[PDB]
Design a protein around this motif. Structure first.
Motif, PDB file in Angstrom:
ATOM      1  N   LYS A 170       0.955  -1.183  -0.053  1.00  0.00           N
ATOM      2  CA  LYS A 170       0.040   0.106  -0.036  1.00  0.00           C
ATOM      3  C   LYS A 170       0.935   1.335   0.112  1.00  0.00           C
ATOM      4  O   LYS A 170       0.436   2.288  -0.555  1.00  0.00           O
ATOM      5  CB  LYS A 170      -0.895  -0.035   1.123  1.00  0.00           C
ATOM      6  N   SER A 171       2.070   1.291   0.623  1.00  0.00           N
ATOM      7  CA  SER A 171       3.062   2.408   0.709  1.00  0.00           C
ATOM      8  C   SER A 171       3.886   2.715  -0.501  1.00  0.00           C
ATOM      9  O   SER A 171       4.468   3.616  -0.678  1.00  0.00           O
ATOM     10  CB  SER A 171       3.876   2.241   1.945  1.00  0.00           C
ATOM     11  OG  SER A 171       4.590   1.000   1.918  1.00  0.00           O
ATOM     12  N   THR A 211       5.453   4.062  -3.783  1.00  0.00           N
ATOM     13  CA  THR A 211       5.219   5.195  -4.497  1.00  0.00           C
ATOM     14  C   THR A 211       5.424   5.022  -6.093  1.00  0.00           C
ATOM     15  O   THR A 211       4.918   5.929  -6.793  1.00  0.00           O
ATOM     16  CB  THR A 211       6.538   6.147  -4.138  1.00  0.00           C
ATOM     17  OG1 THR A 211       7.809   5.540  -4.536  1.00  0.00           O
ATOM     18  CG2 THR A 211       6.074   6.357  -2.706  1.00  0.00           C
ATOM     19  N   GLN A 235       2.620   7.610  -7.748  1.00  0.00           N
ATOM     20  CA  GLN A 235       1.873   8.865  -7.244  1.00  0.00           C
ATOM     21  C   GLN A 235       2.556  10.298  -7.798  1.00  0.00           C
ATOM     22  O   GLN A 235       3.518  10.321  -8.557  1.00  0.00           O
ATOM     23  CB  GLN A 235       2.365   8.644  -5.854  1.00  0.00           C
ATOM     24  CG  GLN A 235       1.940   7.597  -5.103  1.00  0.00           C
ATOM     25  CD  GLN A 235       2.241   7.713  -3.327  1.00  0.00           C
ATOM     26  OE1 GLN A 235       3.273   8.302  -3.097  1.00  0.00           O
ATOM     27  NE2 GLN A 235       1.772   6.858  -2.602  1.00  0.00           N
ATOM     28  N   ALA A 267      -3.116   7.746  -6.576  1.00  0.00           N
ATOM     29  CA  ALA A 267      -2.704   7.951  -5.035  1.00  0.00           C
ATOM     30  C   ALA A 267      -2.306   6.799  -4.345  1.00  0.00           C
ATOM     31  O   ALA A 267      -1.269   6.764  -3.577  1.00  0.00           O
ATOM     32  CB  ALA A 267      -4.268   8.275  -4.155  1.00  0.00           C
ATOM     33  N   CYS A 268      -2.797   5.348  -4.962  1.00  0.00           N
ATOM     34  CA  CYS A 268      -2.240   4.178  -4.160  1.00  0.00           C
ATOM     35  C   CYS A 268      -1.934   3.324  -5.459  1.00  0.00           C
ATOM     36  O   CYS A 268      -2.632   2.396  -5.949  1.00  0.00           O
ATOM     37  CB  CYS A 268      -3.416   3.716  -3.568  1.00  0.00           C
ATOM     38  SG  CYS A 268      -2.755   2.312  -2.524  1.00  0.00           S
ATOM     39  N   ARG A 315      -2.076  -0.631  -4.740  1.00  0.00           N
ATOM     40  CA  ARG A 315      -3.344  -1.214  -4.684  1.00  0.00           C
ATOM     41  C   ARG A 315      -3.772  -1.245  -6.345  1.00  0.00           C
ATOM     42  O   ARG A 315      -4.538  -2.180  -6.588  1.00  0.00           O
ATOM     43  CB  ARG A 315      -4.414  -0.476  -3.854  1.00  0.00           C
ATOM     44  CG  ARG A 315      -5.944  -0.812  -3.985  1.00  0.00           C
ATOM     45  N   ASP A 316      -3.650  -0.367  -7.109  1.00  0.00           N
ATOM     46  CA  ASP A 316      -4.385  -0.073  -8.389  1.00  0.00           C
ATOM     47  C   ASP A 316      -3.526  -1.114  -9.134  1.00  0.00           C
ATOM     48  O   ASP A 316      -4.271  -1.700 -10.176  1.00  0.00           O
ATOM     49  CB  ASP A 316      -4.051   1.312  -8.792  1.00  0.00           C
ATOM     50  CG  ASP A 316      -5.229   2.251  -8.398  1.00  0.00           C
ATOM     51  OD1 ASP A 316      -5.943   2.004  -7.523  1.00  0.00           O
ATOM     52  OD2 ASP A 316      -5.073   3.272  -8.437  1.00  0.00           O
TER      53      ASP A 316
END
Ligand SMILES: [Zn+2]
Length: 196
Positions: free
Chosen positions: A25-26, A28, A41, A181-182, A185-186
């Protein structure tokens, strides 16, 4: 009125490489080989490797340009949205309208094409350092895919071209980009959708 996206290794065996960053999830920036798609991101470092089989001549350059992936939008110039082009986040070199920046290269040049009005950013090609097998360019994408009045949820491709000193084509590669943003996940969602 539309730049070619055909993969072309050329005489020097030019092609891109991407790190294996995972899908936490973190994360970038993360690259999906199955989708040939980079997820990143906003305004974060995107390392892109440049690989060749043999060294091109001095004066060779590497250009990056974004186009819309869907055919009904491909003639539209990819640019930053009406908000981000005005947010005064300039690095002192990139025009505020340009979606793609290069980080940490004082020899980067930004082009507004006088005929097509498309944007690109170009740097000198350099051979790998001692002990290294490739070189890396650090790109930043300065709008979200969702930005209204800009990309407006339309997918884009980044085309990377290896060029001689006059701008003639030596090599070409490309990848889809989603700025979101993520990214972790995407990437997981879209890879699952592909499998299903
Ligand atoms: Zn924007």
């Amino acid at each position: 009125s539309v730049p070619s996206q055909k993969t072309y290794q050329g005489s020097y065996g030019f092609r891109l490489g991407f790190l294996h960053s995972g899908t936490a999830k973190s994360v970038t920036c993360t690259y999906s080989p199955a989708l040939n798609k980079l997820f990143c991101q906003l305004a974060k470092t995107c390392p892109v490797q440049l690989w060749v089989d043999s060294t091109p001549p001095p004066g060779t350059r590497v250009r990056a340009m974004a186009i819309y992936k869907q055919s009904q939008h491909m003639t539209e110039v990819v640019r930053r949205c009406p908000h981000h082009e005005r947010c005064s986040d300039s690095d002192g070199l990139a025009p505020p309208q340009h979606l793609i920046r290069v980080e940490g290269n004082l020899r980067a040049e930004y082009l507004d094409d006088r005929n097509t009005f498309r944007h690109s950013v170009v740097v000198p090609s350099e051979p790998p350092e001692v002990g290294s097998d490739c070189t890396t360019i650090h790109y930043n994408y300065m709008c979200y895919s969702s930005c209204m009045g800009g990309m407006n949820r339309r997918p884009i491709l980044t085309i990377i071209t290896l060029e001689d000193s006059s701008g003639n084509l030596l090599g070409r590669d490309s990848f889809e980009v989603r700025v979101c943003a993520c990214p972790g996940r995407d990437r997981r969602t879209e890879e699952e959708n592909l499998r299903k």
